[PDB]
């Protein structure tokens, strides 16, 4: 019953970050033309991560404000910097709110 309820509890983590991806690959399609249904996406999405206690796969990480949860797009709602003065990052803002995000470069 170990191996058992360990196989179905990976599996389920498996199952959310799927479901992850596809909430996010959605929220980029639609955002440009229905932002307002692409922040249902990312937030739909965060709930997800929130039950099975997962992370957010790297590539959408950093997609979305953290804050408003609006899905970012470089040039529409989004400015990205990167700063070296000690540790390079990356400096996300979110212009629909404000927030500011940092990431490590390397
Ligand atoms: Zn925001």
């Known amino acids: 019953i170990v191996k058992?309820?360990?196989w179905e509890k990976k599996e389920k983590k498996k199952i959310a970050i799927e479901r992850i991806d596809?909430?996010?690959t959605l929220a980029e399609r639609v955002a440009r033309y229905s932002?307002?249904?692409?922040?249902?996406?990312?937030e739909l999405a965060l709930e997800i991560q929130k039950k099975a206690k997962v992370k957010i796969p790297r590539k959408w990480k950093r997609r979305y404000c953290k804050r408003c949860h609006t899905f970012l797009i470089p040039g529409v709602n989004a400015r990205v910097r990167?700063?070296?003065?000690?540790m390079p990052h990356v400096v996300i803002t979110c212009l629909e709110c404000?927030?500011?995000?940092?990431?490590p470069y390397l």
């Open 35 to 42: 932002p307002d249904l692409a922040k249902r996406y990312v």
């Open 82 to 86: 990167l700063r070296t003065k000690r």
């Open 22 to 24: 596809t909430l996010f």
């Open 98 to 103: 404000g927030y500011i995000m940092r990431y």
């Open 4 to 6: 058992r309820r360990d």
